[PDB]
């Protein structure tokens, strides 16, 4: 989950804006073949839990 | 971390008895004697008491179990023999359990009564014998070879 | 659901205790289990059943260090002598896994092999070079410094001696024996008539019995 | 399955290149230099006082110190051998051959 | 410096007084700390 | 649920259970029996003395 | 060659099975909840702290 549960901004049309900040530690499988001259392809997968 | 880890359900019975088995992960202070390292043994303790209530409010005692209709106090730490996995470096030699009441502190102190479970544990020196001690001794005894050079 | 069916799929980080057998390290196979059960409910009030015989590995990320060869889940009924009407149920999911040994092959076994190869090289170096002891003692010093690498990289468990640890101790003893034998050879090489008299058995063995096989001058 | 929860995903990718300057300055170039020292023993005399074996084996000792230095920095997976580990093993083997 | 200590805080709350003879001799109570007014005593020079 | 809910409603609503009060007279002590089961011994850290 | 062993748990109603081994075993231990008795075939190697009774007779583990 997100780090801070800030306020949402509700507009007269009912459209809700939310900008919470987050500290995320995500899983990045490190390809080690060319270490320390390597490059990595890390991923951040966001989805609904429920 | 004074408290138990998982606050599970209590079991109550028609007699009014309440049974509670909370599990806990505890980090306690065990002073280390290094005199005979790596052939040393340590004496650690787990001291359980109530900081909310005194001896006037609660009375601590060991569990009373029964064998063949005769009751006895459980004066030891219970270890399930079938399910227990021994620690990688520490063998357990003694597991006593005591109820300690010291008269030095005042009676209105919650620290007057406690139940202490002790672990006397011997180090298994195999790692240190193999990796450090034997090479150290064998290199140190080569100092006698310069007299033949 | 409208029928009262509840599905609950929470995540968790499971830190489980597992008997680790380091006898064959780094080529070891482990079998680690997760026993799950209702803590305060026995089988007579809550019945737990496994969803499948096997744990679900469909969303399993490939591990960096281990390969899971086998996985299964077993339900266990436990009865106690005091109560013969109330079982205690558990479900134990076990995983049999194999370590990938490439890291320890590259970083521990190969330098030990190279030092073991270097150990026997001092016996081709002539004593007149004045470098036999330098070579042997420096091989020992390199092994001693590599002990830092090994104490950093290898688990500190006393349940068993790792196979790689046996290789280490063998190489250490090998180098020490090389040093002792080199001291003996060097002592032999500066034996002089003013200090020593050649025994007859040394002349019988090391001059005629063996060198006749070799190609030099008695 | 449309009724299951987590199947529509928004995935953000980060393709990141490592800046290797620390490893070049502190590990790779000193190791290259110390290993190239061992090539100099072919110009020392082959007699007492030339000190070929001293130089070669002390270079190997320095390389073992470097093994300890990199041992605390390389990842510990086992699909592939790192490039730095391959190079250090190669330098070790070269020093072994120089000693031979 | 990491220490394990027991504080000892004494004060007087005039609102929590009673006559013991009107309550069957009860002269002391053990009340959860969240239920009473506490002084806001903190360690000012904590490092964490 | 019927007898379980009935018993809970009898013990905690009809009888007005108070968890803040000890189950004893004011001058009496409650006997607590304690036992310990060692599930597993994780570690003894020598430097941190723990 | 065959044998009849018992295999029930603890104080459950007795059951029996056919052991192809030359011994039947009773295995007794005590966890925090109570005493467990396991009956079966052979003479297994038990962990320390477990009572074991091996016997070479029909219906001998009870
Ligand atoms: C050297 C021995 C050091 C003594 C330590 C020792 O007991 O042996 C250890 C080093 O096992 C070895 O013997 C080391 C492996 C090979 C030796 C290296 C040089 C050749 C192994 O212990 P063990 O006793 O050989 O066998 C284990 C069984 N026991 C520990 C439960 C008894
Ligand atoms: C374990 C292995 C240990 C291996 C040790 C060997 C070390 C290398 C040298 C071997 C040759 C020595 C030699 O030739 O000396 C003499 C022979 O007499 C001896 O050999 C002396 C006695 C040696 C005892 C060895 C075990 C105790 C010392 C262990 C010390 C190292 C311990 C290392 C532990 C890791 C040569 O002189 P001589 O022929 O006697 O003629 C003169 C006679 N006179 C003096 C009377 C005039
Ligand atoms: C002796 C002690 C054990 C030896 C045998 C171990 C058994 C084994 O699995 O062999 C393995 C030993 O892996 C190798 O291929 C050798 C080590 C890697 C090469 C040296 C690295 C740096 C080379 C620079 C100079 C073979 O398994 P593999 O997975 O086929 O090997 C990995 C493949 N790879 C080497 C291409 C990365």
Swiss-Prot record, chain A:
It is found in: Postsynaptic cell membrane; Cell membrane. Glycans are attached at residue 41. It comes from the Eukaryota. Disulfide bonds join 28-42. Belongs to the ligand-gated ion channel (TC 1.A.9) family. Acetylcholine receptor (TC 1.A.9.1) subfamily. Gamma/CHRNG sub-subfamily. After binding acetylcholine, the AChR responds by an extensive change in conformation that affects all subunits and leads to opening of an ion-conducting channel across the plasma membrane. Pentamer of two alpha chains, and one each of the beta, delta, and gamma (in immature muscle) or epsilon (in mature muscle) chains. This is Acetylcholine receptor subunit gamma. The chain holds residues 123 to 172 of 519 of the full protein.
Swiss-Prot record, chain C:
It comes from the Eukaryota. It is found in: Postsynaptic cell membrane; Cell membrane. Glycans are attached at residue 31. Disulfide bonds join 18-32, 82-83. The chain crosses the membrane at residues 101-125, 133-151, 167-186. Belongs to the ligand-gated ion channel (TC 1.A.9) family. Acetylcholine receptor (TC 1.A.9.1) subfamily. Alpha-1/CHRNA1 sub-subfamily. One of the alpha chains that assemble within the acetylcholine receptor, a pentamer of two alpha chains, a beta, a delta, and a gamma (in immature muscle) or epsilon (in mature muscle) chains. The muscle heteropentamer composed of alpha-1, beta-1, delta, epsilon subunits interacts with the alpha-conotoxin ImII. Upon acetylcholine binding, the AChR responds by an extensive change in conformation that affects all subunits and leads to opening of an ion-conducting channel across the plasma membrane. This is Acetylcholine receptor subunit alpha. The chain holds residues 131 to 348 of 457 of the full protein.
Curated annotation (Swiss-Prot), chain E:
It comes from the Eukaryota. It is found in: Postsynaptic cell membrane; Cell membrane. After binding acetylcholine, the AChR responds by an extensive change in conformation that affects all subunits and leads to opening of an ion-conducting channel across the plasma membrane. The chain holds residues 74 to 121 of 505 of the full protein. The gene is CHRNB1. Coiled coil: none annotated. This is Acetylcholine receptor subunit beta. Pentamer of two alpha chains, and one each of the beta, delta, and gamma (in immature muscle) or epsilon (in mature muscle) chains. The muscle heteropentamer composed of alpha-1, beta-1, delta, epsilon subunits interacts with the alpha-conotoxin ImII. Belongs to the ligand-gated ion channel (TC 1.A.9) family. Acetylcholine receptor (TC 1.A.9.1) subfamily. Beta-1/CHRNB1 sub-subfamily.
From Swiss-Prot, chain F:
It is found in: Postsynaptic cell membrane; Cell membrane. It comes from the Eukaryota. Pentamer of two alpha chains, and one each of the beta, delta, and gamma (in immature muscle) or epsilon (in mature muscle) chains. The muscle heteropentamer composed of alpha-1, beta-1, delta, epsilon subunits interacts with the alpha-conotoxin ImII. Belongs to the ligand-gated ion channel (TC 1.A.9) family. Acetylcholine receptor (TC 1.A.9.1) subfamily. Delta/CHRND sub-subfamily. After binding acetylcholine, the AChR responds by an extensive change in conformation that affects all subunits and leads to opening of an ion-conducting channel across the plasma membrane. This is Acetylcholine receptor subunit delta. It comes from Bos taurus. The chain holds residues 22 to 71 of 516 of the full protein.
